[PDB]
């Protein structure tokens, strides 16, 4: 699915945003949790589900950190992501449907923060990046 234009367009995008990666991770994660309260069932061991809370800020930073790794290995996602895929299918057994939800909250936050830079054409490429990302995360489920 990712074309050479998606790569350039998302790589360039990553460089702009991303000083603010942790921000985006905590803004996207905490939004998913209140907006879609069915994703809460997976993190109910935390302290602290609300927007801005420490567990969200800390888990936000991680999510966006592995999305950075994924962008550096964008030509071999299929490799960069397979271990996250064993963990999500097998130890956490996250319903694949939830991935679409995080990625929407993530397009929302990009763009809420960089409106500026989130043309419909950048939106295309980002959204394809993140379906690819879900598609690779799905590798290990069955």
């Amino acid at each position: 699915s990712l074309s050479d234009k998606d790569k350039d367009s998302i790589k360039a995008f990553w460089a702009k945003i991303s000083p603010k990666a942790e921000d985006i991770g905590a803004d996207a994660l905490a939004r998913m949790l209140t907006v879609y309260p069915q994703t809460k069932t997976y993190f109910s061991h935390w302290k602290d589900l609300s927007p801005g809370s420490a567990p969200v800020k800390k888990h936000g930073k991680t999510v966006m950190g592995s999305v950075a790794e994924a962008v550096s290995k964008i030509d071999d996602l299929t490799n960069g992501l397979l271990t996250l895929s064993e963990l999500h299918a097998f130890q956490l057994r996250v319903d694949p449907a939830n991935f679409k939800i995080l990625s929407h909250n993530l397009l929302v936050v990009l763009a809420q923060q960089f409106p500026n830079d989130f043309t419909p054409e950048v939106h295309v490429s980002m959204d394809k990046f993140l379906s690819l990302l879900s598609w690779s995360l799905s590798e290990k489920y069955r």
């Binding site: 209140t34 929302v108 763009a111 809420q112 054409e121 939106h123």
Partner: protein, 146 residues
């Protein structure tokens, strides 16, 4: 469906700031660019051949306004949305055969353009929460009536 008075006023303050003439055309343009299979439902429109043509197309624009008008109709009838949409449902189910997943995609492009316009201070998690419950009622009500 029950609304909180927090929801009600969140929805109403947000809608109150939306320029329908701006968000409407913008949200429809973004759906046809980001989910371009969706162009086939609108091939009476032009000239959907590229992002530029989409943004310059008068029928896209007009129709983005008309979509915000569907939303405004749910706004004024928030306790009975399903009934307000009954004809709309039939036209999108029984007549256009728009696969429901598309109503989700448009609602998402609407959200994105709202977020982009208002930024972090106005497009608060709690606001997104209530906006989203609202769009999920709309989408539901659009969306086959069994």
């Amino acid at each position: 469906v029950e609304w909180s008075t927090a929801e009600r006023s969140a929805i109403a303050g947000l809608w109150g700031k939306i320029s329908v003439d701006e968000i409407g055309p913008q949200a429809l343009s973004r759906l046809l660019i980001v989910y371009p299979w969706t162009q086939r439902h609108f091939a009476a429109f032009g000239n959907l051949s590229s992002p530029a043509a989409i943004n310059g197309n008068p029928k896209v624009a007009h129709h983005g306004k008309v979509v915000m008008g569907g939303l405004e109709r749910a706004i004024k009838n928030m306790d009975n949305i399903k009934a307000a949409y009954s004809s709309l449902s039939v036209m999108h189910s029984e007549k256009l055969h728009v696969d429901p997943d598309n109503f989700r995609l448009l609602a998402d492009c609407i959200t994105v353009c709202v977020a982009m316009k208002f930024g972090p201070s106005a497009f608060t998690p709690d606001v997104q929460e209530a906006w989203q419950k609202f769009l999920a009622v709309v989408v539901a009500a659009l969306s086959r009536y069994h």
